[PDB]
Amino acid sequence: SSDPLVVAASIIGILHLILWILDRL
Amino acid sequence: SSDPLVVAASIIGILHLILWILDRL
Amino acid sequence: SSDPLVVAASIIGILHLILWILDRL
């Protein structure tokens, strides 16, 4: 388990990646 | 909970995101 | 130890870095 702030940051980072890929495609 | 260095990195990453968005807007 | 979602995000981030470097080289 991780600090909730670290979980939140990981979620935001993954979604940032996903949105960038979808934008480029 | 997380290593303090990982918490710090998550904070910096989130703030980096926020600043980028504000700059673009 | 960390939340599995945080481990996954860290792996994805490292691989993202690696792929970017290989692309540029």
Next chain:
Amino acid sequence: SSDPLVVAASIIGILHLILWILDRL
């Protein structure tokens, strides 16, 4: 505390940031 892989990723991310800033300055 965090998984060692997550600590490593956080270190790499911070250093990536630092190098980018120094390059731009």
